[PDB]
Structure 1
Amino acid sequence: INMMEYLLQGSVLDHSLESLIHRLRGLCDNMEPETFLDHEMVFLLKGQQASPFVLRARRSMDRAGAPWHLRYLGQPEMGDKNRHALVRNCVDIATSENLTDFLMEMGFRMDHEFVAKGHLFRKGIMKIMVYKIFRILVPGNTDSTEALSLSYLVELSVVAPAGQDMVSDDMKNFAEQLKPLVHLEKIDPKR
């Protein structure tokens, strides 16, 4: 069926970051952190419509043999069903490594690349990712990069089935367990 993604987002200045990580190692599951390092690139298809189609492709540079990942994110639902999280339609697809070449045949062109380097935790269904967004200049190269800002970004995400309430309330409680350190909230993608 059609699965929905619930998002809460925020940010954290880096000099307080470690305390956040220590807080997360208390609250999230009994695991060591994951330290993911990913290359993300955004393709778009300039169809007839006013809205061009958008697709996100991620190659996990750090882990060899990890399948590439496609993600289609639907536009956010204006209905006030879950009032507190970004509720979107998510289609996530594991793929082989010729993907970009295949997408070049489908009519897609690139928009921007960015590295993302950070940590990954989980709590039940929830996925906490705390990462820094790295701008790539010299667009072919993945080493020539610069940090976008001083702050790290924090995302609390749950991918789950369409509708399916009592999900955003648990995300509210897990966000409120961090509220001195981070302010996580449903931020609209407009402006």
Structure 2
Amino acid sequence: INMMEYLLQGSVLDHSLESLIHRLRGLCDNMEPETFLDHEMVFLLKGQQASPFVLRARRSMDRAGAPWHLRYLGQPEMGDKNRHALVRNCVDIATSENLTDFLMEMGFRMDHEFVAKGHLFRKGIMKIMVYKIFRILVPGNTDSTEALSLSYLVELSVVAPAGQDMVSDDMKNFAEQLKPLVHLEKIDPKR
């Protein structure tokens, strides 16, 4: 079958992050944080059609023995079923450790890279992730990193099969539980 992803996004200043972490520890499940660290690449294939194909590939620099991960995300749906979150079509694949060579030989070209570092939380079927984006220059090395801004980014995500109503409502309630600190909205990828 096909799956769908519902998304909500926001940001927080980094001089008040401890209070947000304490609140998320108090609200989420009784599980210790993970502190992930991932490298990310974006591949683009430009054919005859105007819109090029785009794929994302991730890798874990912290835990050895974790397979690579592909991801493809389609255009957001304009249908008026759920109107409080980004609803998109997602396909995710676990792949062996020669992904770049095969993707290059199909015809894809790399576009840009970044490194993300942050924390991860689970609540029911909801995924909270709070991370900071870095910048990679001199693309051969992965130690030439500088911070991009003065704020962390916060994501609320739920992945579920098609249909499956009364999910955005629970996401709205959980977002409103965090209103005095972070303000999460539906925002379009365009500007």
Q: TM-score, normalised by structure 2?
A: 0.98
Q: How far did 1:90 drift?
A: 0.5
Q: How far did 1:163 drift?
A: 2.2
**d(CA) in 1 for partners of 2:22, 2:66:** 28
Q: How far did 1:141 drift?
A: 1.1
**d(CA) in 2 for partners of 1:158, 1:83:** 15
- 1:140-160 Cα offsets, whole Å, 9 max, x none, are 111101111110000000011
Residue in 2 that maps onto 1:63: 63
- 1:83-114 Cα offsets, whole Å, 9 max, x none, are 00100000010111100111001110011100
- 1:53-99 Cα offsets, whole Å, 9 max, x none, are 00000001111111110000111001121100100000010111100
- 1:117-139 Cα offsets, whole Å, 9 max, x none, are 00000101100000001111111
What are the residue-to-residue correspondences of 1:46-57 with 2, within 5 Å? 46-57=46-57
Residue in 2 that maps onto 1:99: 99
What is the root-mean-square deviation of aligned Cα atoms in Å?
0.6
Q: How far did 1:14 drift?
A: 0.5
Describe the SS at the equivalent of 1:15: coil
**d(CA) in 1 for partners of 2:175, 2:143:** 34
Describe the SS at the equivalent of 2:59: strand
**d(CA) in 1 for partners of 2:39, 2:164:** 31
**d(CA) in 2 for partners of 1:80, 1:189:** 18
**d(CA) in 1 for partners of 2:141, 2:165:** 43
Question: 139-148 vs 82-91, which deviates more?
Answer: 139-148
Residue in 2 that maps onto 1:160: 160
**d(CA) in 2 for partners of 1:153, 1:80:** 27
* Percent identity between the two aligned chains: 100
**d(CA) in 2 for partners of 1:145, 1:80:** 42
Q: Number of paired residues?
A: 191
Describe the SS at the equivalent of 1:169: helix
